[PDB]
């Protein structure tokens, strides 16, 4: 079965350290750049409200066939609200595992996910509300946009440097991700080798795998050896749309891989040229942006 990679670093900054994100990320860099990804838990009382326009949030998620690459050698189109997507997502997971959604071990979803990706016997199909522009229905963080009411208790979050809308981006706006069990993202790095930062507003965890930048060429070499040859000649920007690869394959080839379960209220930071991939444990809502130092 699947062997979980070692855990990436988790930081629990004090209020003093939590004052400036770029200063904190610079200070953790000597460790975090050696693991590619890291997780940051804000202080316990740092709880931003969810600020998307929930009544009008409507989207058509993309369909994901888990074993599509293995099948190299149909489904109807569905529009959802946030509520109706969650009902679908929870019903899917509880039916699949025959138990309540929060009782399914994170290790079991992870093991099953990687089995299904390589299985030709069972064709599991899921849906992912990925790459939703925060311009559509607003960011999940409060913003001094004047469009949505900012309560006094929320102004500190509108002004916080950990609000993804306030990260420096000039060498763009955050994107939103509505997940369900087994929805996923394949191995990639950011445009211009940028950092990325991801906040899980609510829901079940997002499971990540990361590779430090010093091993980027090692990963690309394993891809060269083992990814489907039909896509081998493709430029990286296109290959990255279908670069699905079990972390144990990279590990067997000597590529360092680290993992984490990002829970609600936690940030993940990916360092420049740190390959990463992952999948969602269940119904959740994330926001991410590329930033520059």
Ligand X SMILES: O=C(O)CCC(=O)C(=O)O
Binding site for ligand X (CB under 6 A): 130, 177, 185, 196, 198, 206, 270, 286, 288
State the residue number with the nearest CB to Mn ion.
196
Q: How far is the CB of 218 from Mn ion (least distance, A)?
A: 19
Shortest spacing between CB 208 and ligand X, in angstroms: 8
Would the annotation count 102 as a binding residue?
A: no
Is the distance from CB of 150 to CB of 100 less than 8 angstroms? no
Query: Do residues 139 and 201 touch, judged by C-beta distance below 8 A?
Result: no
Closest CB 274 distance from Mn ion, rounded Å: 9
Q: How far is the CB of 182 from ligand X (least distance, A)?
A: 12
Task: Please indicate if the annotation marks 190 as binding a ligand.
Answer: yes
| Residue 197 CA from chain centroid, whole number | 9
The position carrying tokens 């209020």 is 15
- Does the protein bind Mn ion through residue 184 (CB under 5 A)? no
Binding letters toward Mn ion, positions 188-217, x by CB under 5 A? --------x---------------------
| 139 binding Mn ion? (CB under 5 A) | no
Binding-site residue set for Fe cation? 188, 190, 276
What residues line the site for Mn ion (CB under 5 A)?
196
Binding-site residue set for 2-oxoglutarate? 128, 196, 198, 206
């Amino acid at each position: 079965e699947f062997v979980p990679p070692p855990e990436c670093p988790v930081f629990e900054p004090s209020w003093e350290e939590f004052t400036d994100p770029l200063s904190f990320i610079g200070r953790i860099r000597p460790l975090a750049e050696k693991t590619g990804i890291c997780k940051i838990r804000p202080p316990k009382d740092w709880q931003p409200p969810f600020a998307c326009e929930v009544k009008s949030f409507r989207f058509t998620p993309r369909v994901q066939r888990l074993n599509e690459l293995e099948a190299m050698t149909e489904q109807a189109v569905r529009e959802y609200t946030l509520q109706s997507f969650g009902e679908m997502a929870d019903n899917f997971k509880s039916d699949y595992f025959n138990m309540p959604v929060h009782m399914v071990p994170t290790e079991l979803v992870e093991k099953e996910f990687w089995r299904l990706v390589s299985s030709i016997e069972e064709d599991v199909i899921v849906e992912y509300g990925a790459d939703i522009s925060s311009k559509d229905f607003g960011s999940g963080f409060p913003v001094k946009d004047g469009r949505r009411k900012i309560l006094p208790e929320e102004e500190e979050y509108a002004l916080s440097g950990w609000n993804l809308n306030n990260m420096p981006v000039l060498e763009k706006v955050p994107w939103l991700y509505v997940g369900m069990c087994f929805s996923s993202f394949c191995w990639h790095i950011e445009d211009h080798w940028s950092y990325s930062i991801n906040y899980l507003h609510w829901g079940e965890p997002k499971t990540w795998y990361g590779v430090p930048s010093h091993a980027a060429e090692q990963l690309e070499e394993v891809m060269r050896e083992l990814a489907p040859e039909l896509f081998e000649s493709q430029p990286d920007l296109l290959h990255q749309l279908v670069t699905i690869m079990n972390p144990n394959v990279l590990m067997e080839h000597g590529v360092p891989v680290y993992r984490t379960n990002q829970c609600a209220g936690e940030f993940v930071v990916t360092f420049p040229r740190a390959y990463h991939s992952g999948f969602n444990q269940g119904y959740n809502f994330a926001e991410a942006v590329n930033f520059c130092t």
